[PDB]
């Protein structure tokens, strides 16, 4: 039930950027968090058990903007 989730998160700084990481990585079931993207505005979250609606909603309130980009169950 491992899945990869990519979220677009408002994080201009490196410091709201570390805010987002540690927050995504505090979520139950997460295995890794990486930031990617030409604009480094993507959180990649991997784990099993994760509610994507909960991931985004949390990042939303705590960073202001978050939209789901992709959810891919690990083959």
């Amino acid at each position: 039930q491992r899945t990869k989730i990519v979220v677009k998160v408002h994080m201009p700084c490196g410091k709201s950027r570390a805010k987002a990481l540690a927050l995504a990585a505090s979520v139950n079931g997460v295995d890794s968090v990486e930031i990617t993207g030409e604009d480094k505005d993507r959180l990649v979250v991997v784990g099993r058990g994760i509610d994507p609606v909960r991931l985004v909603a949390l990042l939303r309130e705590k960073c202001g903007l978050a939209e789901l980009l992709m959810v891919e169950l690990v083959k």
């Binding site: 990869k4 295995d31 789901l68 980009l69 891919e72 083959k75």
Partner: protein
């Protein structure tokens, strides 16, 4: 659109998990919007313009899904895959 011409996405393959076989590329009116990796012979959900779209991959990374007008997501197998 020419996938053989497109630069590789920004990817990081996590050491524990199986290495996805495909690059996908997402275009709005033939302009590259995003790119990434996904599994072949599989399935993902993706934000494509305004819509959350369910996408199937076949074993040669052909992506199929019901994309909104002006948008498309295209695949190919990564090098050596």
């Amino acid at each position: 659109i020419d996938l053989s011409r497109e630069r590789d996405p920004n990817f990081f393959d996590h050491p524990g998990i199986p290495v996805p076989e495909c690059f996908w590329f997402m275009f709005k009116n033939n302009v590259r919007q995003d790119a990434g990796t996904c599994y072949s012979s599989w399935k993902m959900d993706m934000k494509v313009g305004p819509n959350w779209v369910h996408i199937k991959s076949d074993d040669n990374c052909n992506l199929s899904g019901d994309f909104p007008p002006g948008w498309i997501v295209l695949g190919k197998k990564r090098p050596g895959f």
